[PDB]
């Protein structure tokens, strides 16, 4: 992350309230980390633009730059010609987090309730229960996004707090 040059720029501060309200964020430094990750990448893309065509440094690392972005889901298929990564936008990065993609796959009914789900040892990617909201989905585990075997809505245990309501009925109405 890094701080911007201007601390108080109103229409810039307008859209920061837009995205964080859209994507269910909690810090502006969370936005600043995404821009700083973009700041180094978009830096290095200009450097290969200064090199010749079919340059093997531009061929090897420039296409490995492509394959890392095709993996994470940001880069489309038709725009795979090294110029759309100069004409990008930051919301494509915010799209690829698993905090929103579980809501894009229904099931969350709020951008804020989804964050509540993540921190409570819910959805496993495969067998791996993840508790980090910044995963940057692999684009191939998207249909494998599903509940844990435990932590109900994935079942196999009701959990003790449902067992209290089980105990509050079975002992009061029962014995």
């Amino acid at each position: 992350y890094s701080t911007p040059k201007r601390p108080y720029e109103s229409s810039r501060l307008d859209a920061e309230l837009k995205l964080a309200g859209e994507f269910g964020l909690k810090n502006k430094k969370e936005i600043y980390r995404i821009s700083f990750q973009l700041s180094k990448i978009r830096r290095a893309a200009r450097d290969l633009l200064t090199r010749d065509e079919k340059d093997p440094k531009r061929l090897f690392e420039g296409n490995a730059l492509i394959r890392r972005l095709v993996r994470v889901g940001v880069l489309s298929e038709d725009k795979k010609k090294l110029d759309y990564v100069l004409a990008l936008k930051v919301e494509d990065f915010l799209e690829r987090r698993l905090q929103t993609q579980v809501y894009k796959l229904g099931l969350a009914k709020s951008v804020h309730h989804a964050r509540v789900l993540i921190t409570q040892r819910h959805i496993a990617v495969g067998k791996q229960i993840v508790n980090i909201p910044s995963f940057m989905v692999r684009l191939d585990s998207e249909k494998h996004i599903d509940f844990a075997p435990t932590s109900p809505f994935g079942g196999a245990r009701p959990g003790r707090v449902a067992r209290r309501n089980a105990a509050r009925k079975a002992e009061a109405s029962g014995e």
């Binding site: 309230l17 309200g21 859209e22 964020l25 909690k26 804020h112 964050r115």
Partner: peptide, 30 residues
């Protein structure tokens, strides 16, 4: 020490403004 603050913190503090701005900008853009 003042017992005045009851208003939300952090994410819920972030929650209230976007609900307000959705009410505000919709009549503003119209």
């Amino acid at each position: 020490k003042t017992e005045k603050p009851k208003k939300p913190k952090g994410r819920a503090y972030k929650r209230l403004l976007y609900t307000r701005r959705f009410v505000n900008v919709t009549l503003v853009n119209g």
